[PDB]
From a paper:
Tryptophan-2,3-dioxygenase (TDO2) and indoleamine-2,3-dioxygenase (IDO1) are structurally distinct heme enzymes that catalyze the conversion of L-tryptophan to N-formyl-kynurenine, and play important roles in metabolism, inflammation, and tumor immune surveillance. Both enzymes evolved to bind heme for substrate binding and catalysis but are structurally distinct: IDO1 is monomeric, while TDO2 is tetrameric with two independent TDO2 molecules contributing to each of its four active sites. While apo-TDO2 is catalytically inactive, the term “apo-TDO2 inhibitor” is used to describe compounds that bind to apo-TDO2, compete with heme binding and thus prevent the formation of enzymatically active holo-TDO2.
Two steps were essential for successful co-crystallization of apo-TDO. First, apo-TDO2 was expressed using an E. coli strain that is unable to synthesize heme. Second, the exosite binder AMT was added to apo-TDO2 because of its stabilizing effect as observed in DSF experiments. An exosite that binds both the substrate Trp and its α-methyl analog AMT has been identified previously in holo-TDO224.
Numbering used by the authors:
A (entry chain C): 40 to 168, 185 to 338, 358 to 391
B (entry chain D): 40 to 168, 184 to 246, 250 to 337, 356 to 389
C (entry chain B): 40 to 169, 184 to 337, 358 to 391
D (entry chain A): 40 to 169, 185 to 338, 359 to 388
The structure:
């Protein structure tokens, strides 16, 4: 097949219409403003294509066969590699001065906000808090998000069962026993400024570590919007974090890592967008907050419940 | 106007047809192969748009008005910023395995070579030495004045080259020959230290070769050199007196022409690596003379000093 | 000279001491934490080296000889190229998990804040408003000596074309803006009494209030005192002169300088942003050149800019 | 512990001595030349730290416990992330002109070649074919087991290769020969045409390449000439991981083989950039070839032997 025909370059390379030229005098830098945003749209289509395919593996039940974990992780990694290029793409509009932008702003009247349908679809399908387009926007909100599909899959994490292993029970016992042992060590210290400072550190860290086990606090924060994943999904994600080296949890740990990567890359893009808007015109959204929050619970290695010989065979291929 | 209408997203976002899907079974990774090359094409259109505008400033005589030097240099810098992003873009196809590419390769049968019309137009318009009106557009790119030719013409008019008004080439030949003569007496010291006499003979052969107009006319004919002898003198004048206000922005232009040249090479290098990655870069740089002139190791003290009248002029 | 001796690799490659290894059990990922921060320090030394050299060109009066504008602009561009690499460098600590960082954190107890002496010196020398010893002498010198913002402010106050006797840029600008706004008010009043006219009447009143605020020296002196602005009123006039007449040969390279000062400023912000994200990842716009950003976004139509007289055009030509 | 003391900044920040300043007149741009190469050295020490730790997991037998595959893959991925930054680092020396480099070149006299001990150690420890205390470190890098050798040993133990068990090589040879026989008959059907001739040539070229995989004598010959580095048994093992990458036990080893090719091509991009830098200022063999070669054997999906239910569970 011919390169140009295969890539439909008759549509792609004939979609650049300068409003300054159509409404009188052409402004050279306006072509850059068209091309950058068209190139963002081509990459948003690729990100959407990969996102929906990963969503489909979860929805249609193929995620149950752990043979499909490679395809899930490699497509999410591809999404982060694309996002890194889109953040780098801002360097191109930075080659345009605001003084030059002012010469063609008037012909477009650009609003200082996210006006991309694909970016809104992307935000909705991940799990962010007219006419034919409105149907696509409604479907993005009604259908299962990546956050929901991941939450469902996390609730089935092996090792959580109270009969077998009882990860949450052993964790609560080891943390409370470790904090009790730490309190005694602090009390036995010589009464000094450092000893009083260590009581504050201990009391603060104890309040934080034990708050993990407060299901009522989590249910309250979930209602306020400050948390997104279920209490059972939090236990499942922590199981993957703590036992990441276990073969059945190695690739799911890479998945949880890339979901946090995509989340912070989405934030860097929005940050850059806001900077660009202020550069030209002048003067919470983390879907996987729980994954970032769970990754910063500072539990000492020795307090993590150990893997039994029978349990070690359970999380092995 | 509305974002999607302004960007004509009805054409842009409805140009993705997977040949695996049209000819039977869809292969997911084929969409990435379409999008990357369409995104390269959007940027090749922008690079062409900037390149032709800079070519126009030289062709229509606006380069004579030094007020336009900022616009020329900023658009060439923009071309290098876009090229750096296109070199970075190879990281996206690197997320596709060759094993996965093999699953959709039969539906397109990709040739191991540059098949872009815009890339060939870009190469031609800079100065690098398939059917219908595309062959006519390719012939216009070969017939019209290249950036190398337009820059060569402008370089021949560089101030300070006047045979008696400064006479840059005459003073340079005299100071270099006198400096090499003074170095030959200082080189001839004790026993052969032997490495210093050999290094002098090699460096003398290279430095003095600059003044051989017959050797340059020969290399120009063989294709090993692209700029005229007068243009070489003009570019060296800008290099040596880069600090002079009139030569500050033209020095930025000569540097960015070498930057775009080496970025064009990095892109072609990456393309060849990608082709070998999926299936079973030399000194052909348009501005070879600019790289060659920038590496002539003439000591700072040997450069002719700026005349009091010439210092006000430049 | 030998590569390793020239680069003093006997010091550089023997400066990596893992506190986990020193205090008992070694933790592999701790070496990464040392190397990345030592590499940031090497580049902070280079940025300081370039910054001080550019500061010296302004202090010793060499900036007056416009022959030195290339050296000033190329070193500031080099500073932004280095800053872009430092922002990219965050990708290396992102290869370390917070869970793995936790295994060596106890041995160092890293504070969640900027603890680099060189980064503080860099911030001070540029002109950032806002525990040591001996190093407190270097910190005091950074605070007492002229900042880049001050040196640039002084140089901006000397911009050609500002003089009321010759050209009078500020006078012509105020006249053309007020006359242009008066002509725009007539076009708004000459329009019907429709919703579009009233919507345009409010947009005109707001845009007129913004444009004319540029000429309020008392408002600027107040904002300067509150910290919301950093450059003098005369320096603002000088920077706008360079912005509007950037094409003029004598103003081409100074325009590149003003552009790179805004680039370094936003790159310094991206670095601090990334630092804060890294700290939250592991543990859980006060820009120096605000005025340059603010002046670049005053939406004045091209036709309202005062024209260059034939005698004045020859003045700004080298 | 204090930031500056912990990082030993007393050594790090007092290792910059400009030879221009020591030998008379200081040249400002010389400081950049020192800092960039010192920063490359800090990263070569980190790469070596990660590389040796991964070598140790293979040497001490910990690679046998597949629980350690995550730590092996994440440290190799970290090595490629560091290498990408070192390739990006060339942008810093590109802010220095050759004319400015010439003003300090005389004081150091830099040779146009790899003069780093750490880069040589890195090259040797990966497996690149080839002072007093430093010469001992260089000899240990050549005598000790390379990453290529340690990976080759581990690849020879890949499950599924055993002729008694799954017999991957036997089923592959049978399916390829039968598939090529079926393709030959399909080609020899339409009347002798240009398209038929194009199909006969493509078939004969692809048949010669596919069947060459089963020539152990050709591989033993190429291994002796240096054109190939991995043993014949290791090639079978790597192809087993490529073809059955989706199998849970082979998912992480596939990521490892992918990153070994990434590090390899990044090492090439670094050396390429080094050579370009040397030509910019003066003017003047991939360790895992077999992994790249195996990834480009164009075998149709349906010809790959199907996973036996006994082998799939293992
Ligand atoms: Cl192509 C186009 C058409 C109409 C508005 C925009 N606005 C930009 C923001 C922006 C505004 C002024 C100066 C620089 C940038 C924009 C970019 C991306 C998105 Cl998702 N929405 C919006 C762009
Ligand atoms: Cl979109 C399309 C359609 C048909 C052929 C190509 N060939 C690629 C090269 C390439 C070949 C195989 C695997 C990876 C890459 C190509 C890329 C860029 C250019 Cl200018 N020409 C050519 C691509
Ligand atoms: Cl090498 C070293 C020694 C002691 C403290 C820090 N703190 C880091 C911040 C940071 C803290 C925890 C996890 C990740 C990062 C830091 C980095 C840069 C600067 Cl200027 N100050 C501080 C680092
Ligand atoms: Cl720090 C130092 C001291 C002495 C020689 C080199 N040579 C550089 C190459 C190079 C040569 C001239 C101009 C630009 C670059 C070099 C860089 C990296 C390595 Cl591994 N070996 C060597 C550098
Ligand atoms: C059979 C299973 N894939 C089990 C499962 C669920 N979540 C997981 C997380 C990590 C590892 C395994 C799981 C499934 O139920 O989908
Ligand atoms: C007025 C002029 N631009 C002079 C000129 C020619 N080449 C140059 C290079 C550097 C500086 C100036 C020139 C012209 O004749 O076009
Ligand atoms: C002679 C002069 N260099 C003039 C000057 C000052 N600031 C400027 C900005 C742009 C152009 C020129 C200047 C001086 O007074 O420093
Ligand atoms: C037990 C084992 N790790 C088996 C092994 C060897 N090479 C492999 C490649 C992929 C998967 C497994 C292997 C060993 O013998 O090292």
């Amino acid at each position: 097949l011919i390169y140009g025909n295969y890539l439909h370059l008759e549509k792609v390379l004939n979609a650049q219409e300068l409003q300054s030229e159509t409404k009188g005098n052409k402004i050279h830098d306006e072509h850059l403003f068209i091309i950058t945003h068209q190139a963002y749209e081509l990459w948003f289509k690729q990100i959407l294509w990969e996102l929906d395919s990963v969503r489909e593996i979860f929805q249609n039940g193929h995620v149950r066969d752990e043979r499909n974990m490679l395809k899930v992780v490699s497509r999410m990694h591809r999404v982060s590699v694309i996002l890194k290029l889109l953040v780098q793409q801002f360097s191109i509009l930075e080659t345009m001065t605001a003084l030059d932008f002012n010469d063609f702003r008037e012909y477009l009247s650009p609003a200082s906000g996210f006006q991309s349908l694909q970016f809104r679809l992307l935000e909705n399908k991940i799990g962010v808090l007219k006419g034919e387009e409105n149907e696509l926007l409604l479907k993005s909100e009604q259908e299962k998000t990546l956050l929901e599909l991941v939450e469902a899959w996390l609730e089935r994490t092996p090792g959580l069962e109270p009969h077998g292993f009882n990860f949450w029970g052993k964790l609560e016992k080891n943390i409370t026993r470790g904090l009790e042992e730490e309190f005694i060590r602090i009390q036995a210290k010589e009464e000094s400024e450092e000893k009083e400072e260590q009581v504050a550190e201990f009391q603060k860290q104890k309040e934080v570590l034990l708050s993990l086990f407060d299901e009522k606090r989590h249910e309250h924060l979930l209602s306020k919007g400050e948390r997104r994943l279920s209490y059972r999904a939090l236990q499942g994600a922590l199981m993957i974090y703590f036992y990441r080296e276990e073969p059945r949890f190695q690739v799911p740990f890479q998945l949880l890592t890339s979901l946090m990567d995509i989340d912070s890359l989405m934030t860097k893009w929005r940050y850059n967008h806001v900077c660009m808007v202020h550069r030209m015109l002048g003067s919470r959204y983390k879907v996987f907050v729980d994954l970032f929050n769970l990754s910063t619970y500072l539990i000492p290695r020795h307090w993590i419940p150990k893997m039994n010989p029978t349990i070690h065979k359970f999380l092995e291929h």
